[PDB]
């Protein structure tokens, strides 16, 4: 679990969105595993606007942050799950690192701010849903 709080927006994994997130829906994209809902309180985070390929992510299954090298946002085949059929997930960045299903929502950050959130993983891999292209989050 985990979310990004920027301005009056809350960004979460679409598969983990609550009834309240859907009741206050701003935007969602099943192909990216992202959902954005509106909030009444001002958010704590800054979004990176960069092309960094190194950063640090929080891994809740180890209670630790790990430094990673990650690929550029791209279309990656993701296996079938309880929430989605076998499909290509877009704007996904892969890295070598530990992750478990419950790590989804852990934030990936670089020196410029929030890059994305954990969305996929397996066998010593971790995938992050990019948010740097969502310029409207800053206004
Ligand atoms: C960090 O995730 C993992 C890490 C290690 C191994 C594995 Cl199988 C995962 C899990 C993974 O890849 N998905 C990705 C998927 C998607 N974004 O399309 C959403 C999936 C889902 O339905 N989760 C709910 C709790 C059961 C979980
Ligand atoms: Zn950066």
UniProtKB/Swiss-Prot annotation:
Catalytic reaction(s) noted: Selective cleavage of Tyr-|-Gly bond in the picornavirus polyprotein
Catalytic residue positions: 15 (for protease 2a activity), 33 (for protease 2a activity), 104 (for protease 2a activity)
Domain of life: Viruses
Residues engaged in binding Zn(2+) 1: 50, 52, 110, 112
Function comment: Cysteine protease that cleaves viral polyprotein and specific host proteins. It is responsible for the autocatalytic cleavage between the P1 and P2 regions, which is the first cleavage occurring in the polyprotein. Also cleaves the host translation initiation factor EIF4G1, in order to shut down the capped cellular mRNA translation. Inhibits the host nucleus-cytoplasm protein and RNA trafficking by cleaving host members of the nuclear pores. Counteracts stress granule formation probably by antagonizing its assembly or promoting its dissassembly.
Subunit structure: Homodimer.
Name of the molecule in the record: Protease 2A
């Amino acid at each position: 679990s985990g979310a990004i709080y920027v301005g009056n927006y809350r960004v979460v994994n679409r598969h983990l969105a609550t009834h309240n997130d859907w009741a206050n829906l701003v935007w969602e994209d099943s192909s990216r595993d992202l959902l954005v809902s509106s909030t009444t309180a001002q958010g704590c985070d800054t979004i990176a606007r960069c092309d960094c390929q190194t950063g640090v992510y929080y891994c809740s299954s180890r209670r630790k942050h790990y430094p990673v090298s990650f690929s550029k946002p791209s279309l990656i085949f993701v296996e079938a799950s309880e929430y989605y059929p076998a499909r290509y997930q877009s704007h996904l960045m892969l890295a070598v690192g530990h992750s478990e299903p419950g790590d989804c929502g852990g934030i990936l950050r670089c020196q410029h701010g929030v890059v994305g959130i954990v969305s996929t993983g397996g066998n010593g891999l971790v995938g992050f849903a990019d948010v740097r292209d969502l310029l409207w989050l800053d206004e």
